């Protein structure tokens, strides 16, 4: 029996994928960075939907995505009321600026209001709860090997200012472009295709 | 080669140690971590390799 | 404390939105429903 | 069925209940477990099967195997 | 059967209401999501030879902004519209400067109707709907997207952003039931938005042809 | 006004690498100090490495139009 | 030495348990299991039967092996083989289903 | 997916497969007998039901009552169908649901002897007396993995995945199922392309294409990247219609003779 269903499989399989190399010849991504084929038809505006090449994409998980609120408010929200916990964390320098500063305080407030946004999206884009996704850049791998390169010594104060990472966070949602282009369509494309990896 | 850092569980990894103690230090020398390149604990598999 | 109050009275303002659009939406009901019932 | 006598009533009832219960399909087989936390839920409830220990969620019902 | 039937009727109210709201015509966010005890009270809940009986439940809104744009929705008696009918009908609407219309029919309607539903197009719109197709309102289904009418000026926008020829872009046939729910006719794109789980969101756009 | 991708893309690396390779083979003047090397793909590699290709890609795009990018323009992935 | 007695009982138990079944049917008291017939309900009990009776052998079988055993290192260094591999060849192959 | 409360109760999910499921004469009748009896209250079998009710032949058309309890069916609405769909042309005396026989009387008042034969032999092939035709039987199974468990937020946050009563179909009708009350009409996929494409819609047809294609490439274990499927959809389901991979629906597609030739019907597209 076994035989026979490999000899059958050798027959059939060999024709299927013939069919299909046959569909689907002459689709390519075309320097528009869209993907098309002889006729010159689109047949997506990015290729898979996002543009981005099949071969430098891993596993990830999504951390904001199915939390418990509870959680998710004591996880993310960087409470600035308990000095205690700021200079365990952050340096003298700085726990002073957190608190005395209105500016900052807001700042991190839209952050975490941005972020609550985000894990609404997740949650009506993802149902079932699913946190393995695939994406480009290995977060956690970098910031791994980040630590063991400047030897961050996880247990002393360290001098990295709040503000400095909502600002570079922003900056590199900048800079990290699919769409190209100032058109408000051009830019609602960008910010649609770049959606989930932000 | 290089500083490559990565963590893998070995094929005979029992699942009821990383809930109890010795999560970090493993009787059964399992759960490969790799900091700097270098091989810390556990036996590589194919599911490391 | 004072941009909560600012931004409830602005929901208020848009639940009047909403009781204009009802009374708009009745005021012009009246008139279709002569003609539902001319139609039959 | 409501002017049935009793024991008409009590016959009906029961071909009803067996005739429901055979409808039903047979609920897959394994051995159930809470060693084995489900990723997508996160309870610990859990069937494995093993053939490759394929790992099925109680209640969230994650479906994974294990190498 | 009785309770059945205006069940049924209820349900292809709801969704006809659901479906101009959809379009843009304006219509009470009351009727837009009213239960089924109104329904009863207020017609009378004996379809069966009495009060609810079809042709006296049809409805006419106005488009939002145009107030002057209206649609009719009929529901012919027969369960095999004739011509007679619709010709009716079209000749009644020639009193109003009314253009759209949508017609429920029983059944299929016989070919030699389509005929003259098509022949009459561009003076008067009218397209048809079976109850069984009315039943359920599909925007809502998992699987079916959101979907967007788009306007000329904002096709051409993408049109001349993309440097891409209208003919270039997907096909979708007029047949297709998202088509013809929302109305779009040919020569007209519509917009999609779908949760991509790669992207996050991803918008495309198709015209019909 | 170019909208084509500021990096080269592996095939037009390979492509480029190849031609100047071959014009090379067919005894025309480098564009690199020579350390001692003679193979013509390897003096072509030495010379994408220090940006001195007198090589333009034309980029076409789908309507017709076309970019012409200098090699010394754009960034090099590998 | 051992495990040979622990599958041979537990051959035997299945032997005995599957003939139970067939007694059963044979003097009608095995109820047709919902969404199946009778003989299909029959057959997927002794399936299950034999296939519980075979993991249990195959897992004595793999629990009563040495480190120095070289089947074991194979399987779980996965460079080649498998447990069931093990388990056909020392405790039981189990059963020879076609279509 | 069940909608009511009857996702939860069985008892009341029964009725919704029953309802879902095509029932006939022949599924609800045991024996069926014609005979010519002359005279009505002569009634040449021993049965005390026609003189109190009131042609020289009839059928005696009796009926099971275990398939007729599973089902959840009456006498009352089974004479209603019968006297119905062959219009006033017979007289079915049905018989009270107390008797344990549950006999029938089918007569025709107004090749009359084969006439009997043949409206008993097309009525009991098929007349539809609960269902939809098409779905032959239908399945009742709780969901033990995820991808059919209920998913609801709960107020603190957490997913709590539900349990609730699914029925599993073995036709296609789509359609008509959709419109039956205590069924959810927004997670009730059809498995089938073609179905969907005359339901929903050609973007409901691709990602129905796009979940079964990837169902059945991860049943075995194995990982295919989103992209690849992807793609496939959609070159599948670019121009409108679903294009057959086959030479029947690539060859129609404007490509070129020069592409077509070489997949197939070289001599016939040249």
């Not at chain 1, 990015?46 to 071969?55: K, T, V």
């Not at chain 3, 009802?22 to 005021?27: G, N, P, S």
């Not at chain 5, 047949?175 to 779908?194: E, L, N, S, T």
């Amino acid at each position: 029996e076994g035989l026979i269903d490999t000899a059958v499989k050798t027959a059939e399989t060999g024709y299927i994928q013939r069919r299909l190399i046959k569909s689907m010849e002459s689709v390519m991504v075309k320097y528009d960075a869209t993907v098309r084929n002889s006729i010159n038809q689109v047949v997506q505006l990015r290729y898979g939907e996002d543009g981005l090449a099949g071969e430098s994409v891993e596993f990830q998980n999504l951390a904001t995505l199915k939390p418990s609120n509870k959680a998710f408010e004591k996880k993310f929200r960087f409470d600035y009321t308990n000095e205690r916990a700021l200079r365990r964390t952050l340096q003298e320098d700085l726990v002073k600026d957190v608190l005395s500063n209105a500016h900052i305080q807001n700042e991190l407030e839209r952050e975490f209001e941005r972020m609550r946004e985000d894990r609404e999206v997740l949650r009506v884009i993802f149902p079932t709860g699913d946190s393995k996704v695939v994406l480009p850049c290995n977060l956690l791998r970098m910031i791994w090997n980040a630590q063991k390169i400047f030897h961050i010594n996880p247990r002393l104060p360290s001098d990295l200012h709040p503000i400095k990472v909502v600002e570079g966070v922003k900056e590199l949602s900048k800079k990290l472009v699919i769409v190209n282009g100032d058109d408000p369509l051009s830019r609602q494309a960008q910010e649609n295709a770049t959606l989930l990896f932000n | 080669p290089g500083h490559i850092n990565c963590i893998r569980t070995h094929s005979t990894h029992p699942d009821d140690e990383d809930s109890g103690p010795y999560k970090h230090i493993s009787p059964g020398d399992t759960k490969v971590v790799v900091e700097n390149g270098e091989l810390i604990m556990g036996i590589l598999c194919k599911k490391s390799l | 404390r004072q941009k909560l109050l600012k931004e409830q009275e602005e929901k208020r303002l848009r639940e009047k939105e909403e009781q204009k659009k009802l009374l708009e939406q009745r005021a012009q009901y009246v008139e279709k429903t002569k003609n539902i019932l001319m139609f039959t | 069925e409501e002017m049935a006598s009793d024991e008409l009533k009590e016959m009906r009832k029961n071909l009803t209940k067996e005739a429901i219960r055979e409808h039903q399909m047979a609920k897959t087989g394994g051995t159930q477990t809470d060693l084995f936390t489900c990723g997508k839920c996160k309870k610990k409830n859990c069937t494995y099967t093993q053939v490759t220990t394929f790992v099925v969620c109680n209640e969230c019902g994650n479906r994974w195997k294990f190498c | 059967d009785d309770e059945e039937e205006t069940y049924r009727l209820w349900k292809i109210r709801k969704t006809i209401m659901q479906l101009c709201h959809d379009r843009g015509y304006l219509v009470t966010q009351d009727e837009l999501d009213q239960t089924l005890e109104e329904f009863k009270a207020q017609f009378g809940d004996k379809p069966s030879e009495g009060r609810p009986r079809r042709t006296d439940l049809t409805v006419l809104v106005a488009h939002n902004d145009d107030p002057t744009d209206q649609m009719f929705v009929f529901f012919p008696e027969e369960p095999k519209v004739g011509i007679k009918t619709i010709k009716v009908y079209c000749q009644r609407m020639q009193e109003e400067n009314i253009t759209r219309a949508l017609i429920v029919v029983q059944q299929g309607m016989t070919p030699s109707a389509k005929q003259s539903l098509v022949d009459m197009a561009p003076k008067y719109i009218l397209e048809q709907f079976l109850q069984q197709e009315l039943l359920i309102n599909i925007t809502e289904h998992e699987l079916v997207p959101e979907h967007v009418v788009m306007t000329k000026e904002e096709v051409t926008e993408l049109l001349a952003r993309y440097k891409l020829r209208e003919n270039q872009l997907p096909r979708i046939q007029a047949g297709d039931p998202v088509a013809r729910y929302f109305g779009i006719k040919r020569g007209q794109v519509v917009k999609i938005i779908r949760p991509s789980e790669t992207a996050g969101r991803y918008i495309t756009y198709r015209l019909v042809q | 006004k170019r909208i084509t991708t500021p990096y080269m893309t592996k095939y037009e690396r390979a492509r480029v690498l190849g031609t100047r390779a071959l014009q090379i083979a067919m005894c025309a003047p480098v564009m690199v100090e020579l350390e001692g090397e003679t193979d013509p793909l390897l003096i072509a590699m030495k010379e994408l490495k220090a940006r001195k290709i007198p090589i333009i890609i034309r980029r076409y795009l789908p309507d017709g139009s076309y970019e012409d990018w200098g090699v010394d323009e754009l960034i090099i992935s590998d | 030495s051992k495990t040979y007695q622990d599958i041979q009982n537990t051959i035997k138990k299945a032997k005995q348990d599957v003939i139970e079944v067939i007694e059963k049917a044979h003097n009608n008291e095995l109820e047709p299991t919902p969404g199946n017939t009778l003989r299909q309900t029959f057959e997927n009990q002794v399936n299950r039967i034999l296939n519980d009776a075979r993991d249990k052998t195959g897992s004595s079988a793999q629990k009563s092996l040495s480190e120095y055993n070289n089947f074991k290192s194979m399987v779980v260094s996965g460079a080649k083989g498998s447990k069931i591999n093990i388990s056909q060849v020392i405790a039981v192959v189990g059963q020879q289903n076609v279509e | 997916f069940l909608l009511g409360q009857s996702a939860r109760d069985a008892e009341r999910a029964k009725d919704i497969l029953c309802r879902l499921e095509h029932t006939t004469l022949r599924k609800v009748t045991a024996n069926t007998a014609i005979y010519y009896d002359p005279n009505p209250q002569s009634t040449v079998v021993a049965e005390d039901q026609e003189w109190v009710n009131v042609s020289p032949w009839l059928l005696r058309v009796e009926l099971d009552r275990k398939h007729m309890t599973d089902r959840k069916l009456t006498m009352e609405q089974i004479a209603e169908k019968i006297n119905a769909g062959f219009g006033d042309d017979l007289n079915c005396i049905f018989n009270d649901d107390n008797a344990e026989k549950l006999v029938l009387r089918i007569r025709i008042m107004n090749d009359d002897d084969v006439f009997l034969r043949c409206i008993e032999s097309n009525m009991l092939t098929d007349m539809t007396l609960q269902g939809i035709e098409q779905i032959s039987k239908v399945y009742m199974h709780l969901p033990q993995t995820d991808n059919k468990k209920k998913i609801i937020i709960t107020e603190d946050g957490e997913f709590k995945a539900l349990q609730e009563w699914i029925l599993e179909t073995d036709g296609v009708s789509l359609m008509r199922v959709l419109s039956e009350k205590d069924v959810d009409p927004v997670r009730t996929t059809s498995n089938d392309i073609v179905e969907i494409f005359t339901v929903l819609g050609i973007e409901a047809v691709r990602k129905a294409l796009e979940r079964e294609l990837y169902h059945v490439i991860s049943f075995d274990g194995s990982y295919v990247n989103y992209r690849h499927l992807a793609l496939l959809c959609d070159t599948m389901t670019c121009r409108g219609h679903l294009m057959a991979i086959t030479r029947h629906g690539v060859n129609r597609q404007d490509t070129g003779p020069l592409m077509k030739c070489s997949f197939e019907e070289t001599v016939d597209v040249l």
